Amino acid sequence: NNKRWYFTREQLENSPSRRFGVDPDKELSYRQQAANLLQDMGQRLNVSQLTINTAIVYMHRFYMIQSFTRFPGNSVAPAALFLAAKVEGQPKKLEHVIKVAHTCLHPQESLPDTRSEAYLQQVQDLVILESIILQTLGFELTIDHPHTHVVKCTQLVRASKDLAQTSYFMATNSLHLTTFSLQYTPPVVACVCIHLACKWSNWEIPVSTDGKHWWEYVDATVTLELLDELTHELLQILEKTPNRLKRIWNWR
Amino acid sequence: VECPFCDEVSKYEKLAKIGQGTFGEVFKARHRKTGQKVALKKVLMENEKEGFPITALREIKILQLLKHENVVNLIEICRTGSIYLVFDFCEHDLAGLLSNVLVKFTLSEIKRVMQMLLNGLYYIHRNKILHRDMKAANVLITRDGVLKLADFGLARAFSLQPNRYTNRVVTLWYRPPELLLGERDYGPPIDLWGAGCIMAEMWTRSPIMQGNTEQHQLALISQLCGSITPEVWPNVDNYELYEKLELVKGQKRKVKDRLKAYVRDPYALDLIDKLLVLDPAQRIDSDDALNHDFFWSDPMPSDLK
Numbered sequence: 001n002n003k004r005w006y007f008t009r010e011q012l013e014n015s016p017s018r019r020f021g022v023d024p025d026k027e028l029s030y031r032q033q034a035a036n037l038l039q040d041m042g043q044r045l046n047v048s049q050l051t052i053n054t055a056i057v058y059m060h061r062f063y064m065i066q067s068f069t070r071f072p073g074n075s076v077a078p079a080a081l082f083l084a085a086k087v088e089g090q091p092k093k094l095e096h097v098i099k100v101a102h103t104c105l106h107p108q109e110s111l112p113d114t115r116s117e118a119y120l121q122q123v124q125d126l127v128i129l130e131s132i133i134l135q136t137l138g139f140e141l142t143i144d145h146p147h148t149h150v151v152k153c154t155q156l157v158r159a160s161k162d163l164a165q166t167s168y169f170m171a172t173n174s175l176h177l178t179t180f181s182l183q184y185t186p187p188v189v190a191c192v193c194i195h196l197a198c199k200w201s202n203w204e205i206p207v208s209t210d211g212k213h214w215w216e217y218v219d220a221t222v223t224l225e226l227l228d229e230l231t232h233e234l235l236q237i238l239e240k241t242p243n244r245l246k247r248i249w250n251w252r
Numbered sequence: 253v254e255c256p257f258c259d260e261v262s263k264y265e266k267l268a269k270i271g272q273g274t275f276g277e278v279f280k281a282r283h284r285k286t287g288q289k290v291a292l293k294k295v296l297m298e299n300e301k302e303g304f305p306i307t308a309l310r311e312i313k314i315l316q317l318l319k320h321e322n323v324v325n326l327i328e329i330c331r332t333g334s335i336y337l338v339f340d341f342c343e344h345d346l347a348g349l350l351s352n353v354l355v356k357f358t359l360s361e362i363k364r365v366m367q368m369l370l371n372g373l374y375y376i377h378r379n380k381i382l383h384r385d386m387k388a389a390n391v392l393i394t395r396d397g398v399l400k401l402a403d404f405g406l407a408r409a410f411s412l413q414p415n416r417y418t419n420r421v422v423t424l425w426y427r428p429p430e431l432l433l434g435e436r437d438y439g440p441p442i443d444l445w446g447a448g449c450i451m452a453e454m455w456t457r458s459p460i461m462q463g464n465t466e467q468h469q470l471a472l473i474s475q476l477c478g479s480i481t482p483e484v485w486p487n488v489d490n491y492e493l494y495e496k497l498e499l500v501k502g503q504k505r506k507v508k509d510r511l512k513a514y515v516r517d518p519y520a521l522d523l524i525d526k527l528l529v530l531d532p533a534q535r536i537d538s539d540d541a542l543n544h545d546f547f548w549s550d551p552m553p554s555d556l557k
């Protein structure tokens with residue numbers, strides 16, 4: 001429905017994973033870890049960030065229903081990406097995804113003979129898992145991403161290519177590092193992204209002639225008290241993430 | 253393993269195949285608790301070696317988007333392992349009706365049918381979807397007399413380095429000239445061609461251009477709509493398959509004449525002629541056809557009984 005995949009804070013704390021004794025902080029790592037695995041595979045498999053993001057969202061929702069203690073991120077992530085790639089028009093072959101997921105989780109090991117049975121199984125497992133992801137998501141595989149609205153947000157502030165790129169950066173990273181995709185609609189997340197991208201670049205946008213703030217043309221429900229509340233949380237976890245801010249840090 | 257958003261299809265009591273002959277494996281079924289009638293399409297997994305079929309993902313994507321009085325309605329998706337698409341049930345298919353001899357259509361009812369059909373097409377096109385499988389058999393009608401377009405199996409989104417859409421689409425009999433001349437940059441106008449054939453079928457009770465091969469199809473189309481001259485269809489040259497294979501040369505348009513006997517109504521014939529136009533860029537669109545004097549003269553479009 002319209003609110004089936006959006007949760008409260010009280011709901012995120014009482015996650016399926018919490019119910020099996022996984023601390024609140026570990027669940028978050030577990031998520032981030034899956035995100036990273038998706039990104040690493042996604043780049044080797046030569047698919048788009050759009051696909052990777054769709055996969056990351058599948059993974060997020062999936063773990064609002066299933067628990068990490070029954071489905072390990074390193075199993076779900078590849079199946080999730082296998083699915084996203086089909087959905088977003090960039091299908092990758094089942095054997096191709098297994099191949100890549102392997103060298104990602106086992107940089108050292110060598111790929112079993114694609115004739116063995118221990119391989120024929122890990123192929124059946126992926127397929128099985130993709131089925132479980134579909135059923136879990138109830139076949140809602142059409143995902144809206146904050147990125148879509150970033151153009152529309154940054155078009156307003158007439159920001160440089162630079163503030164734009166940075167805003168997308170914030171977008172993608174919010175998917176990796178936070179559970180925003182589970183709490184706030186894309187257009188709101190998009191605002192949070194631009195807002196923080198501005199703070200970071202020191203960019204300041206003047207109030208318009210109407211007297212309205214830049215973000216009211218984006219979502220009726222967005223308020224400065226929220227943007228500051230969110231961009232703080234987002235910035236915090238970005239500071240905890242090694243080498244991440246460096247990518248948008250002005251070194252001049 | 254938990255599953256709050258995908259019910260076991262066992263909640264539906266199967267009844268009868270309706271049917272495999274329509275290109276899909278479809279059952280009628282009854283909600284064990286409410287009696288609600290539904291159609292279950294199984295997702296066929298024979299010869300599928302790449303997980304859940306990308307084909308079925310398209311269809312489900314499209315149906316979840318297409319919500320409209322004249323488009324079949326996906327209610328939910330069910331499991332059991334196997335996966336089922338579940339629709340609101342449609343008692344009739346326009347082909348079963350047209351072949352049944354005890355069934356009889358008044359001009360006003362036919363108006364209504366075409367209206368719904370064309371209105372349904374307007375919606376999907378507006379939503380950037382091509383049906384690509386127009387045929388009487390794919391036009392359903394509910395017991396309360398509402399028409400629904402169905403079977404979005406070969407369906408596909410379209411948009412605007414020309415396009416490279418699949419060319420092997422549309423049943424041969426309802427396939428337009430563009431696709432027989434090997435076109436790969438098409439759009440809405442193809443579905444409307446089918447709308448044409450279907451409309452004609454409404455008086456002739458039988459598909460009007462039943463070819464054996466693609467060259468035989470283009471053959472029949474010319475004997476009815478005229479030859480494929482750049483006089484009629486500007487730039488029909490650039491198509492390699494143009495001269496490469498047959499075609500005629502002396503054919504003059506016999507659409508109105510050949511159908512005259514069956515159709516009768518002048519406005520009816522007039523609309524059929526603008527639907528069965530050779531050049532897609534000149535073939536009437538769904539908006540203008542809904543506005544054609546056919547639907548705004550007597551008798552007026554009436555409900556179905």
Ligand SMILES: Nc1n[nH]c(N)c1/N=N/c1ccc(O)cc1
Pocket residue numbers: 270271274276278291293311324339340341342343392402403404405
């Ligand atoms: N709803 C229905 N009632 N009776 C049918 N044959 C019927 N078919 N529905 C379909 C069939 C195929 C499809 O891709 C989508 C809907």
